[PDB]
Amino acid sequence: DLIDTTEMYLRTIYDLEEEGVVPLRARIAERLEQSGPTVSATVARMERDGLLTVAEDRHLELTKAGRARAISVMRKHRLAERLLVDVIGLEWEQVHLEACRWEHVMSEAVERKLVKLLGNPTTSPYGNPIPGLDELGVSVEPVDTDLRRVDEVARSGGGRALVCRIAEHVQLDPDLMSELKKVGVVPGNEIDIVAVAGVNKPIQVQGSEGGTQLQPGIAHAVMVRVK
Amino acid sequence: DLIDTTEMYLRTIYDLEEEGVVPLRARIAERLEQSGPTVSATVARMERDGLLTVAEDRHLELTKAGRARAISVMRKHRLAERLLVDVIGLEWEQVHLEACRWEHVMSEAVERKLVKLLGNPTTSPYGNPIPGLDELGVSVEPVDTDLRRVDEVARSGGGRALVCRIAEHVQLDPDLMSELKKVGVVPGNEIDIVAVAGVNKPIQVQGSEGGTQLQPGIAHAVMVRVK
Amino acid sequence: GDSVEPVDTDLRRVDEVARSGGGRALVCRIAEHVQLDPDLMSELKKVGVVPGNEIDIVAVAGVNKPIQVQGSEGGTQLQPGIAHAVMVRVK
Amino acid sequence: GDSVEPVDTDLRRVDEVARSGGGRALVCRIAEHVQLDPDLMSELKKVGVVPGNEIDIVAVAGVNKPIQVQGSEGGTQLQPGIAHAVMVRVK
Amino acid sequence: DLIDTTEMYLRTIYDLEEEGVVPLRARIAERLEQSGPTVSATVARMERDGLLTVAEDRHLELTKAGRARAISVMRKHRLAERLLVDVIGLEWEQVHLEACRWEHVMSEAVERKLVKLLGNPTTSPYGNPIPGLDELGV
Amino acid sequence: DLIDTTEMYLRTIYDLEEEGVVPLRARIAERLEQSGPTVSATVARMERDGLLTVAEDRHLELTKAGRARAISVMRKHRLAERLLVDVIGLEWEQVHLEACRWEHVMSEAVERKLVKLLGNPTTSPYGNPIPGLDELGV
DNA sequence: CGTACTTAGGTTAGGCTAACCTAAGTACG
DNA sequence: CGTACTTAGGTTAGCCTAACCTAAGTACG
Ligand SMILES: [Co+2]
Ligand SMILES: [Co+2]
Ligand SMILES: [Co+2]
Ligand SMILES: [Co+2]
Ligand SMILES: [Co+2]
Ligand SMILES: [Co+2]
Ligand SMILES: [Co+2]
Ligand SMILES: [Co+2]
């Protein structure tokens, strides 16, 4: 269950923008595991309500209102994640799924109280920046042009790099997130990315406590700063 | 399976008009065993295509095109029924269900050939008049103001009457049609309608080979000429 | 089910106490019904009707009549439905 | 399944007969493929290519070459896919 | 248009077998005038429902259930054709297209009545044998 | 608005039992501000799903499963209230409305973490006992 | 004669499969 | 180097339940 269909469509489009993926309805269908017809009908309903527009090349464009609402949901999501990790102490691999429900029920009133409690946090526990803090009534924005995707680093000849962001896409698989934590592919840990040739090949990575394989779509969603 | 959704919605509206019932979407939901939302969406699609309009009092009104198409389907239905009974010799109780599928696949070309084969028939084997014979390029129309509904005859004090029409609604239940045939409630047979008081009471009828009970909605659909 | 049938049998509803001739009692529970109205909950806090505060319930006669209660920081009127939904222990 | 593999082994395809050096043969089957074109079926009737009519098949060479056949009421040209889809018994 | 997609795919595969043609998806695309993607998707759906299998050489093989259904449709088709020609008197060239729609709506009940009416016919008006008369009990 | 219709109907019936009120459909209509027809239809749907039964005197009786689910929701509600007051510091009057939404999204996993964080609380900030702590393993 | 509920006929949101399409690929003698 | 097919992203028609509504009834101390 999505709890709120509209908010999840908005946040999924936001996720795709952060992963540098073209936000198509095909992407929402696979991500939220819904049929093509369902997604088109729901997007048409959101278009009617003025939260997005379907371009000629068919990529989904958030309106002013759509982006505002998407940011609001993502802000609630990553504040929830912060609360769940830092205060409540919920296990690292279970936090996202919990936060993915909580994002739909949290008031701005609570958000403002969480900002104070958590000491004005700027990133989620997975290194993703918290947007729309201006709208709450709360900093210098990190230059994140230096960040490169693990897949692109691997195809460019690999090397050593610091793990900075694990995108929402990766967080959806708890079993994988447990594997990443064990071997030590977590924010603020150094990893060695093995060189591969040709797109859509599984990337080998070596953490502090062993190594593992990432799928092309997973490696694309993990961002690092190469040493 | 309806075979053709549009044609069956049209013919169901036509059926309701012949039964002197207010053609509401609620009636189509019952008859075709479909959900309220399904019927509203399908009717909206037919309204868009200009086959009917939803009035303020919410009763369905066929357009010129809608009525023309409804007649076309009903004509095919009752010509099929004639063919199935008079030529093929399919059992009286099974014919309607067969004809309800055939009505969607028959060309005007075949209709014209059936008219010649069946000797320009004007009524179905269940006494219902065959419309739209003018549109095939084929008679004085029976004055059927003298016809009265078995339920209304029963509430008005009953009496002896000749069975003239069994509507499509009644034909949908083969087991009932077998019961009607056995006791002898068929077109061109005399029956005695027992007097009842109040609406929604089951009407008792006495045929040549015994008697049976009709539900209010069934009795409403059987038409007779009182002696 | 302490929540439905209290373990502390001496727990009594505000209206029941008032109709039984008022008294000094410690606020114990404020049911979810009462919580639904914030403006009321602001008032209840302001006059000191909160769990673990001693209050004085004004004796009352007739159902469908509001119940007067005195807290540490003043008094206020409860509706019959509201007073029914507040439990206390008389001292 | 007489329909797929004929019980009458002597049943042969018009094109196969033509490429095998023509012959006088009785029309036996006209497959559903042929039936799809009415204008063609009109022509087939007109010239007397119908089941239970003797026809003469003109010997032909090379596939993708149309097959000439002579019926009681004249002759006509079949396409390879059409001639393949007509079965006959050679006299 | 086709009335029943599944039944028409089955009968088209049956047609190709009768014509001694290799039943590929490419053949169905031509015959039914549908796109390659449409045919592959519909064949995959029929494979999933256990009406056929795609072989190694990629020719379509009807299952026991698929063949039983294909025969059923073809039987209805050719009995309809017989009725349309012998009884109704529809023109020889128009009969197939009519029968191609009727094949999807005819009950076995009517088939058994048509067998009696038409005097146990074994071939269509175009000389094509009527299969699955065994399965009617005639 | 309600987030979860079923859970809110269950908790509303639970609320009425705690208040010593007869849980009728009329009470749910008032409390949740829904029409009589809406409540009857939704209660019929919950009866069908085996979460309650309508008695002879027409008071709503939670089934084994219904009560278990109602407790689960109320437990989440009052643990949320504790967290919101003691830890987050949301204003006393706004907490319930927040907790009324949070009760529908909280996992048992989080409940167990809140039990430890809040030092095994037995009552909400409004003095209402927290039920079903047994079912958490506390 | 209100209080509680049913009957009757809607509605939108949010899901689904079947069955059609194009445009631009891959695989193979 | 065409023939057969896949990959990718759409579409409309035709079905569903859940969950809300009003207007006008019935049933009962
Ligand atoms: Co997350
Ligand atoms: Co979410
Ligand atoms: Co009929
Ligand atoms: Co029909
Ligand atoms: Co044919
Ligand atoms: Co067909
Ligand atoms: Co509360
Ligand atoms: Co709630």
Q: Are B160 and B222 in a shared domain?
A: yes
Q: Are D54 and D25 in contact (CB under 8 A)?
A: yes
Write the CB contacts of E57 (distance below 8 Å, at least 6 apart in sequence).
Answer: none
Backbone angles phi, psi at C32, to 5 degrees: -65, -30
| Structural domain containing residue F90 | 74-136
What single-letter amino acid sits at D23?
Answer: G
Retrieve residue E26's tokens. 């490419």
Q: For residues C57 and C37, what is the distance between their CA atoms, to the nearest angstrom?
A: 21
Query: Residue E121 CB: number of other CB atoms within 10 A?
Result: 19
Chain E hits for D51, CB-CB cut-off 8 Å, are 123, 125-127
The interaxial angle of helices B95-102 and B174-183, nearest 10 deg, is 130
Q: For residues B161 and B34, what is the distance between their CA atoms, to the nearest angstrom?
A: 36
| DSSP secondary structure code for residue B43 in this structure | H
| DSSP secondary structure code for residue B120 in this structure | S
Q: Estimate the share of chain B in helix, then strand, then coil, as percent rounded to the nearest 5.
A: 45, 15, 35
Q: Domain boundary residue among F17, F32, F66?
A: F66
Asked if C45 lies within 8 A of F92 by C-beta distance, the reply is: yes
Q: Are E34 and E28 in contact (CB under 8 A)?
A: yes
| DSSP secondary structure code for residue B141 in this structure | P
Closest-CA residue of B relative to E116 is B88
Q: Are F9 and F58 in a shared domain?
A: yes
Q: Is A179 exposed, middle or buried (0-12, 13-18, 19+ CB in 10 A)?
A: middle
Retrieve residue A132's tokens. 């729309």
Q: For residues D33 and D80, what is the distance between their CA atoms, to the nearest angstrom?
A: 12
C1 occurs within a structural domain:
no
Token look-up 């908010």 returns A7
Q: How many Å does it take to go from CA C11 to C1' G18? A: 63
Backbone angles phi, psi at A53, to 5 degrees: -140, 145
| Preferred mutation among A98, A100, A110, A115 to probe F, highest tally of F CBs within 10 A | A110
Q: Is D31 helix (H, G, I), strand (E, B) or coil?
A: coil
What single-letter amino acid sits at F76?
Answer: K
Q: How far is CA A95 from CA A100, A124, A174, in A?
A: 9, 11, 9
Retrieve residue D63's tokens. 């596939």
Helix (H) or strand (E) holding F26: helix F25-32
Q: For residues E93 and B191, what is the distance between their CA atoms, to the nearest angstrom?
A: 49
DSSP string, C47-71: TT-STT-EEEEPP--SSSSPEEEEE
Q: How far is CA A144 from CA A147, A186, A224, B32, in A?
A: 5, 18, 10, 61
> For strand H, is any atom closer than 7 Å to the CB of E128?
no
Tell me the sheet residues that pair with A204: A213
| DSSP secondary structure code for residue E86 in this structure | I
Q: Are E43 and E14 in a shared domain?
A: yes
D59 occurs within a structural domain:
yes
Retrieve residue E35's tokens. 């796109």
Q: How many folded domains does chain F comprise?
A: 2
Ligand 2 centroid to residue A10 C-alpha, Å: 10
Q: How many Å does it take to go from CA B38 to C1' G12? A: 13
Nominal resolution in Å?
Answer: 2.3
Q: Name the pairing type of β-strands B52-54 and A222-226.
A: unpaired
A142 occurs within a structural domain:
no
Backbone angles phi, psi at B129, to 5 degrees: -65, 140
| Structural domain containing residue A206 | 148-226
Q: Are B58 and B12 in a shared domain?
A: yes
Helix (H) or strand (E) holding E82: helix E64-83
| DSSP secondary structure code for residue E88 in this structure | I
Q: For residues A222 and B16, what is the distance between their CA atoms, to the nearest angstrom?
A: 64
Retrieve residue D4's tokens. 């797929």
Q: How far is CA C41 from CA A50, A167, C63, in A?
A: 38, 42, 23
| Structural domain containing residue D65 | 11-90
Do B and A count as touching (3 or more CB pairs closer than 8 A)?
no
Q: For residues A101 and A99, what is the distance between their CA atoms, to the nearest angstrom?
A: 5
Q: Domain boundary residue among E42, E66, E90?
A: E66
Do E and F count as touching (3 or more CB pairs closer than 8 A)?
no
Q: How many folded domains does chain D comprise?
A: 1
Longest dimension (CA), chain E: 46
Where residue C32 falls (left for φ over 0; alpha for ψ -120 to 50; beta otherwise) is alpha
Ligand 5 centroid to residue E32 C-alpha, Å: 14
Tell me the sheet residues that pair with D11: D89
Helix (H) or strand (E) holding D90: strand D86-90
Q: Are F80 and F131 in a shared domain?
A: yes
- Residues of F from 55 to 94 whose C-beta is within 7 A of strand G: which are they? 58
Q: Report the CATH number at residue A53.
A: 1.10.10.10
Q: For residues A36 and A14, what is the distance between their CA atoms, to the nearest angstrom?
A: 19
A143 occurs within a structural domain:
no
Q: Is C74 exposed, middle or buried (0-12, 13-18, 19+ CB in 10 A)?
A: exposed
Question: Which chains neighbour E (Cβ–Cβ under 8 Å, 3 or more pairs)?
Answer: B, D
DSSP string, E38-51: HHHHHHHHHHHTTS
Tell me the sheet residues that pair with C12: C88
DSSP H stretches of helix in B90-222: 95-102, 108-117, 133-136, 150-155, 168-171, 174-183, 216-219
Q: Are E95 and E78 in contact (CB under 8 A)?
A: no
> For strand H, is any atom closer than 7 Å to the CB of A25?
yes
Q: Are B104 and B3 in contact (CB under 8 A)?
A: yes
Q: Are F55 and F83 in a shared domain?
A: no
Token look-up 């040209």 returns D77
Chain C hits for F93, CB-CB cut-off 8 Å, are 38-39, 41-42, 45
Q: Which strands sit side by side in the sheet containing B203-207, from one edge to the other?
A: B148-149, B222-226, B159-166, B190-193, B203-207, B210-214
Buried b (16+ CB within 10 A) or exposed e, F19-56: bebebbbebbbebbebeeeebeebbeebbeeebbeeee
Question: Which chains neighbour C (Cβ–Cβ under 8 Å, 3 or more pairs)?
Answer: F
Of the candidates B138, B144, B157, B129, the one whose C-alpha atom is nearest the C-alpha of residue B71 is B129
Pick from E83, E88, E107: which is nearest to B98 by CB?
Answer: E107
Asked if D2 lies within 8 A of E127 by C-beta distance, the reply is: no
Q: Domain boundary residue among F66, F93, F110?
A: F66
- A43-49: long-range contacts, CB 8 A cutoff, minimum separation 24: A43/A9, A46/A6, A46/A9, A46/A10, A49/A6
Asked if F3 lies within 8 A of A105 by C-beta distance, the reply is: yes
Tell me the sheet residues that pair with B61: B53
Helix (H) or strand (E) holding B71: helix B64-83
A10 occurs within a structural domain:
yes
Write the CB contacts of F25 (distance below 8 Å, at least 6 apart in sequence).
Answer: F36, F39, F40, F43, F58, F60
Ligand 2 centroid to residue A4 C-alpha, Å: 7
Taking the CA of residue F114 and the nearest CA in chain C, the distance in Å comes to 20
Q: Report the CATH number at residue E90.
A: 1.10.10.10
A141 occurs within a structural domain:
no
D38 occurs within a structural domain:
yes
Q: Is B75 helix (H, G, I), strand (E, B) or coil?
A: helix
Tell me the sheet residues that pair with B166: B222
Buried b (16+ CB within 10 A) or exposed e, E99-112: bbbbbbbbeeebbe
The interaxial angle of helices B25-32 and B5-18, nearest 10 deg, is 110
Q: How many Å does it take to go from CA A66 to C1' H15? A: 31
D29 occurs within a structural domain:
yes
Q: How many Å does it take to go from CA F29 to C1' H21? A: 13
Token look-up 């069975």 returns B163
Ligand 5 centroid to residue E82 C-alpha, Å: 10
- Residues of E from 53 to 72 whose C-beta is within 7 A of strand H: which are they? 54, 58
Q: How many folded domains does chain A comprise?
A: 3
C2 occurs within a structural domain:
no
Q: How many CA atoms lie within 13 A of C14 on its CB side?
A: 31
Tell me the sheet residues that pair with C30: C86
Q: For residues A218 and A176, what is the distance between their CA atoms, to the nearest angstrom?
A: 10
- Compute the Cα dihedral for F58, F59, F63, F65 and give only its sign: positive
Nearest nt (C1') from F36 Cα: G5
Where residue D52 falls (left for φ over 0; alpha for ψ -120 to 50; beta otherwise) is left
Protein residue minimizing CA–C1' distance to G17: A35
**How long, in residues, is chain F?**
138
Backbone angles phi, psi at A226, to 5 degrees: -70, 135
H helices then E strands: how many in chain B? Answer: 11, 8
Q: For residues A154 and A220, what is the distance between their CA atoms, to the nearest angstrom?
A: 10
Q: Are F90 and A109 in contact (CB under 8 A)?
A: yes
Distance of CA E17 to the CA centre of its chain: 11
Q: Are F78 and F132 in a shared domain?
A: yes
Q: For residues C86 and E127, what is the distance between their CA atoms, to the nearest angstrom?
A: 91
Q: How far is CA F75 from CA C4, F79, F102, F128, F135, in A?
A: 13, 6, 11, 10, 10
Asked if B101 lies within 8 A of E105 by C-beta distance, the reply is: yes
Helix (H) or strand (E) holding D24: strand D23-30
Query: Residue A36 CB: number of other CB atoms within 10 A?
Result: 11
Solved how?
A: X-ray
What single-letter amino acid sits at B222?
Answer: V
Q: Report the CATH number at residue C52.
A: 2.30.30.90
Closest-CA residue of A relative to F94 is A109
DSSP string, chain A: --S-HHHHHHHHHHHHHHTT----HHHHHHHTT--HHHHHHHHHHHHHTTSEEE-SS--EEE-HHHHHHHHHHHHHHHHHHHHIIIII---TTTHHHHHHHHTTT--HHHHHHHHHHTTS--B-TTS-B---HHHHT--PPP--SS-EEHHHHHHTT-EEEEEEEE-HHHHT-HHHHHHHHHHT-STT-EEEEPP--SSS-PEEEEETTEEEEE-HHHHTTEEEEE-
Q: Report the CATH number at residue B171.
A: 2.30.30.90
Q: Is B217 helix (H, G, I), strand (E, B) or coil?
A: helix
Backbone angles phi, psi at E23, to 5 degrees: -75, 90
> For strand G, is any atom closer than 7 Å to the CB of B45?
no
Q: Are F84 and F111 in a shared domain?
A: yes
Where residue B158 falls (left for φ over 0; alpha for ψ -120 to 50; beta otherwise) is left
Q: How many Å does it take to go from CA D8 to C1' H8? A: 50
Q: Which strands sit side by side in the sheet containing D67-71, from one edge to the other?
A: D11-13, D86-90, D23-30, D54-57, D67-71, D74-78
Q: Is E119 helix (H, G, I), strand (E, B) or coil?
A: coil
Q: For residues A7 and A34, what is the distance between their CA atoms, to the nearest angstrom?
A: 15
Q: For residues B180 and B188, what is the distance between their CA atoms, to the nearest angstrom?
A: 13
Of the candidates E118, E99, E128, the one whose C-alpha atom is nearest the C-alpha of residue D27 is E128
Distance of CA F127 to the CA centre of its chain: 16
Q: Is F29 helix (H, G, I), strand (E, B) or coil?
A: helix
Query: Residue B73 CB: number of other CB atoms within 10 A?
Result: 20
Q: Are C68 and C58 in contact (CB under 8 A)?
A: yes
CA dihedral E100, E106, E112, E115 (to 10 degrees): -20
Q: Are F83 and F110 in a shared domain?
A: yes
Q: Is B25 helix (H, G, I), strand (E, B) or coil?
A: helix
The verdict on D32 touching E (C-beta cutoff 8 Å) is yes
Token look-up 């849980």 returns F23
What single-letter amino acid sits at C42?
Answer: S
Write the CB contacts of D34 (distance below 8 Å, at least 6 apart in sequence).
Answer: D40, D41, D44, D82, D85, D86, E126
DSSP string, D48-64: T-STT-EEEEPP--SSS
Backbone angles phi, psi at A132, to 5 degrees: 65, 20
D3 occurs within a structural domain:
no
Of the candidates F1, F64, F11, the one whose C-alpha atom is nearest the C-alpha of residue F34 is F1
| Preferred mutation among B103, B113, B117 to probe E, highest tally of E CBs within 10 A | B113
- Residues of A from 45 to 74 whose C-beta is within 7 A of strand G: which are they? 45
The verdict on B105 touching E (C-beta cutoff 8 Å) is yes
B12 occurs within a structural domain:
yes
Residue F81 CA: which ligand is closest? Answer: 7
- Compute the Cα dihedral for B26, B31, B32, B33 and give only its sign: positive
Q: For residues D45 and D40, what is the distance between their CA atoms, to the nearest angstrom?
A: 9
Token look-up 């075949």 returns B110
Chain C hits for F31, CB-CB cut-off 8 Å, are 33
B143 occurs within a structural domain:
no
Q: Are F108 and F77 in contact (CB under 8 A)?
A: no
> For strand H, is any atom closer than 7 Å to the CB of B34?
yes
Gyration radius from chain A CA atoms:
18
Q: For residues F115 and E79, what is the distance between their CA atoms, to the nearest angstrom?
A: 76
What single-letter amino acid sits at B204?
Answer: Q
DSSP H stretches of helix in chain D: 14-19, 32-35, 38-47, 80-84
Tell me the sheet residues that pair with D78: D67
- D67-75: long-range contacts, CB 8 A cutoff, minimum separation 24: D67/D14, D67/D15, D67/D18, D69/D14, D71/D47, D72/D47, D72/D48, D73/D46, D73/D47, D73/D48, D74/D46, D74/D47, D74/D48, D75/D47
Nearest nt (C1') from B41 Cα: H14
Retrieve residue D50's tokens. 């119908």
Token look-up 């009692």 returns C25
Q: How far is CA E14 from CA B167, E19, E67, in A?
A: 41, 9, 8
Q: Are F95 and F125 in a shared domain?
A: yes
Write the CB contacts of E125 (distance below 8 Å, at least 6 apart in sequence).
Answer: D51, E81, E82, E85, E86, E92, E95
